[PDB]
Amino acid sequence: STQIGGMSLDQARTQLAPWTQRAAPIGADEYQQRIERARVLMRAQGVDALLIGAGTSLRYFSGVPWGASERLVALLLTTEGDPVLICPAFEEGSLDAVLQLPVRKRLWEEHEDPYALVVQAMDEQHAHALALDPGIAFAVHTGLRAHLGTAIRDAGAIIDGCRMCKSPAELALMQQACDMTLLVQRLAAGIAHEGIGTDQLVRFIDEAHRALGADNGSTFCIVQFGHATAFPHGIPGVQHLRAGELVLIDTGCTVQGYHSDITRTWIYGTPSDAQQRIWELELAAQAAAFAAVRPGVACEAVDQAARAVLQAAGLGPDYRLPGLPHRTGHGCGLAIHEAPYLVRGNRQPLQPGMCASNEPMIVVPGAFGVRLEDHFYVTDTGAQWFTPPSVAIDQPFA
Amino acid sequence: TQIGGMSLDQARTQLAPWTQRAAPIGADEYQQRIERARVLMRAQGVDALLIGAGTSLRYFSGVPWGASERLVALLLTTEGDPVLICPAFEEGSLDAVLQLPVRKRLWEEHEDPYALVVQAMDEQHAHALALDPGIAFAVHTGLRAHLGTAIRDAGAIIDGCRMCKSPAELALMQQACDMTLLVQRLAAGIAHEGIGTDQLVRFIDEAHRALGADNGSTFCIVQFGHATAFPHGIPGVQHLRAGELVLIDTGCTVQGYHSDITRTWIYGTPSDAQQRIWELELAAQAAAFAAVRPGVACEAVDQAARAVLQAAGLGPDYRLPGLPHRTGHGCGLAIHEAPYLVRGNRQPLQPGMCASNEPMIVVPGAFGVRLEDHFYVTDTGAQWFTPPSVAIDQPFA
Ligand SMILES: [Mn+2]
Ligand SMILES: [Mn+2]
Ligand SMILES: [Mn+2]
Ligand SMILES: [Mn+2]
Ligand code: NA
Ligand code: NA
């Protein structure tokens, strides 16, 4: 190997300059385009009002990046006019400073009923067919239902109808985040040595993400050694690296809210025949899944292409272990997981601009797991990798 | 003497792993929480309770996982081990975190998890479901596809369990507060002219980790000078100058239980206005604490703080200069939870309830002063988790 081990912490740090290729933020015109696309989808669904809660969908339509809390902060979009922004009174100044869209502020003091404000705004515009953000807390349904007597639809089709296909600016922001995380993955492999701790790697990866100018360091970071790699959702526990162990690292960051999410699995020292066999199979399943992607292709077909490779090698079938116990991938954007899902049963056709992970992890019970994760986006004629796949068990980077 | 003068190396000699470790919640207490939920369910005519991944699932089952698009949930009915609905591929990991005996019902990726919930309801002849108000609305959509019956809001049941803390819960929160109080103290000590907000944030995370928090700082806000007048403003690096107030709001978790402490202190010489407002903030916090005892409505605690501000000529109500938001919020496995110390909330305080006391004063465009310490209700009054600040230049008792 020329990529694994052999780099000091100081040497890694010389490569950690703030990222010089900064993708442009989403502009005012694009936020308006998103509002207009939602209105088209609302009309198709027969909905005349849309309530978006704080979180990734509020940031999508308005630029407000705040996480959801027990206090209602929401955008109410109707067929005409600037959308209504419902917000705590004490937050008005902070809101003005992050909004990217002209809005009609409706402010509530702490003891006042914010749900009443939503319905009042609906009534003023003669709206009586609300679709509610499926990511919003159920408590908001309770609050609304105290004032509303009409059917409340689930807004998922509208929200996915907008967010699944990324604009060039969105792709560029995801691209930047992916490029940064790919470097961090490379440096993490470089500094690995006998005895190094999983916690030491997590800490360095966060440090590197910050140094490169991520929104907020590592969004998340999973580091697993040896038998711990057999768990897609294993408990964090400190391990120290021994020769002969696989190392699995899954991490990512955000840039203007847009996510990277890359997994590398590589050998420290000499691999066993079994580790070698399963690693090559993982790459082949990932490759086949990618090869299945072009416009019009059903999402489940991408999952099945990966399973076909595993089955031909005598793993599986279906979700059986040794094999692939979960879906092949998930969409990615302002959220770590979003539509479309590359999962059995999903007939959703792939369209240009859709972004998804490609990670058909193999688990061998009691032994290890191998997960390669790279994201792609659909193009007019096929697909494009955000990051190129690994080359070999001891060459994690193309 | 508490502010400035300490080197980074001096501070680090006080950062050994915490030696007074509170005991983790035991198996018997999880059973007590389930039984308490069942009593409250029955009292409300509810025969099934669905708890989603998040702080309530951790409360009842020990599972710490954050919510995702995949349903992970506990279904509690009137009898038998509660049902745990979980993706099949996660069973192994689920087993390793569960603190409660359960009946696992596993779904493969293409299968409908909502169907499992309703199958489990039907098996026990349940048809009066209450649903976790913190769960994604998507779950209502999924359940409604399968149910003709009302899906009630489980907030009253869940709060009825979680608002009053056990001794073990208090001890875990107490440990988190003690650790964060030390980190706050060390942060004041290493402060110096030109120090960066980002530098303080990093130290505070380093300190939380060294002491043995679950995962460093849960959050950390550090603001200098006029920035203190903008509590929810866009973060941007500042460098400290003499004459500026410093506001630090940070916390950690211990076994999931939260600390959340704010200190505001002067670096250098304060102005008369800074001084007078700081004193008023302390007095508002103290009056709110003095109103706390069993039987007092939560809104009276908020009003006690406002009364102090209005007697001094600030406000009234939420007007500025003054207190533009509520006086405080409950705290436990979540940073914010019931009960809320807010106008309109008639909820009577009961022994064991935990809440923040933080009646911040904002002077628009100038500065803000926030003192935040949490308390719990005792049999006859209240107890501070951490003692309040003493002066504008003595943040620690
Ligand atoms: Mn992923
Ligand atoms: Mn990942
Ligand atoms: Mn607080
Ligand atoms: Mn706080
Ligand atoms: Na919809
Ligand atoms: Na991390």
Side-chain angles (χ1 to χ4, degrees), chain A residues 200-267:
Chain A
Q200 293 180 303
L201 285 172
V202 167
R203 199 53 40 213
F204 167 79
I205 288 168
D206 187 70
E207 172 193 339
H209 270 132
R210 296 188 186 280
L212 298 183
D215 291 349
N216 194 19
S218 304
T219 306
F220 62 91
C221 192
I222 291 159
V223 177
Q224 300 166 323
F225 300 161
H227 298 309
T229 60
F231 297 86
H233 195 166
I235 59 101
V238 183
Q239 302 176 274
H240 296 92
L241 188 53
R242 294 183 291 276
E245 291 187 308
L246 288 173
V247 173
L248 185 151
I249 302 181
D250 187 357
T251 193
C253 70
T254 56
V255 177
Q256 302 280 306
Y258 286 90
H259 290 266
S260 61
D261 179 12
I262 296 166
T263 308
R264 289 290 178 266
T265 301
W266 38 263
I267 187 74

Side-chain angles (χ1 to χ4, degrees), chain A residues 70 91 138 142 154 327, chain B residues 69 90 135 141 153 232 326:
Chain A
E70 76 284 353
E91 299 274 33
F138 180 55
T142 304
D154 180 296
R327 68 190 176 215
Chain B
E69 80 282 356
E90 302 206 307
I135 211 166
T141 306
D153 182 303
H232 197 188
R326 70 195 174 206

Side-chain angles (χ1 to χ4, degrees), chain A residues 303-319 321-373:
Chain A
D303 179 73
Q304 185 49 38
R307 292 185 195 278
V309 168
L310 305 184
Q311 191 169 331
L315 280 71
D318 304 308
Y319 307 98
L321 300 181
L324 165 58
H326 53 68
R327 68 190 176 215
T328 287
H330 56 79
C332 187
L334 286 168
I336 190 68
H337 296 174
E338 55 186 67
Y341 292 91
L342 311 180
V343 63
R344 179 175 291 174
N346 192 5
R347 298 298 308 162
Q348 163 76 59
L350 290 162
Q351 299 162 357
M354 288 180 178
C355 299
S357 76
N358 183 345
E359 45 179 338
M361 173 179 195
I362 297 165
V363 175
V364 181
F368 54 86
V370 182
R371 180 160 88 249
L372 304 171
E373 173 182 21

Side-chain angles (χ1 to χ4, degrees), chain A residues 37-47 158:
Chain A
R37 170 74 171 146
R39 280 176 165 148
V40 165
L41 286 157
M42 286 164 61
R43 285 191 273 279
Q45 197 171 327
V47 146
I158 295 160

Side-chain angles (χ1 to χ4, degrees), chain B residues 219 249-250 260-262 329 358 370 372:
Chain B
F219 57 88
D249 185 357
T250 192
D260 184 355
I261 299 167
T262 307
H329 55 78
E358 37 175 340
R370 184 160 86 249
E372 175 188 15

